[PDB]
A and B are shown apart, each in its own frame.
With several copies, the nearest count.
Chain A
């Protein structure tokens, strides 16, 4: 199970690395749970529809979501922060 990051996702991941260790731990717990099973588990996974079909969403907190997608033997993160 490879872990892909787009540039924008890695930028989001490193923002939470510098700010808020608690949110970083939450994101990490979600990544572990995704690695166990990308379709079920904590953070209420929800598939997205229409022009975002193929992408999935879990809840980091009330304001932020972890957008990811599965292409074969890998998980690809699209976002870790909702607004800057």
Chain B
């Protein structure tokens, strides 16, 4: 699954969102105006879990 956050809301409540992705383990997309500047934020836990799977493949 995926949530979308206004970049101003993401900036104003950054610490709360870094707490949320590390508690719920879901990614969120931060939207601005230029869609080529869209970013995905995820927890360091889930990131390491994916890189672990991608190197297990090798």
Direct contact of A and B (CB under 8 A): yes
Considering the complex, which residues of chain B in the window 1-38 have a beta carbon less than 8 Å from any beta carbon of chain A? 23-26, 36
Contact A52:B49 (CB < 8 A) given known A43-B23, A61-B25: no
Task: Report if A1 contacts B (CB, 8 A).
Answer: no
Q: A7-46 interface mask toward B, CB cutoff 8 Å, 1 = contact, 0 = none? A: 0000000000000001000000000000000000011101
Task: Place the interface of chain B in its size category.
Answer: 10 to 19
Contact A52:B26 (CB < 8 A) given known A47-B49, A61-B45, A62-B46: no
> What count of chain A residues pass the 8 Å CB interface test?
18
Q: How far is the CA of A46 from the CA of B49 in the complex (A)?
A: 6
Q: Are the C-beta atoms of B24 and A48 separated by less than 8 Å?
A: no
Task: Report if A51 contacts B (CB, 8 A).
Answer: yes
A-B contact count (CB 8 A): 54
Q: How far is the CA of A67 from the CA of B36 in the complex (A)?
A: 23
Q: How far is the CA of A67 from the CA of B56 in the complex (A)?
A: 10
Q: A residues near B, CB below 8 A? A: 22, 42-44, 46-52, 57, 59, 61-63, 65, 67
A sample of 24 cross-chain residue pairs with beta-carbon separation below 8 angstroms, ordered by A number, consists of A22-B36, A42-B23, A44-B23, A44-B24, A44-B48, A46-B48, A46-B52, A47-B49, A48-B52, A49-B50, A49-B53, A49-B54, A50-B53, A50-B58, A57-B56, A61-B45, A62-B25, A62-B46, A62-B49, A62-B50, A63-B49, A65-B52, A65-B55, A65-B56
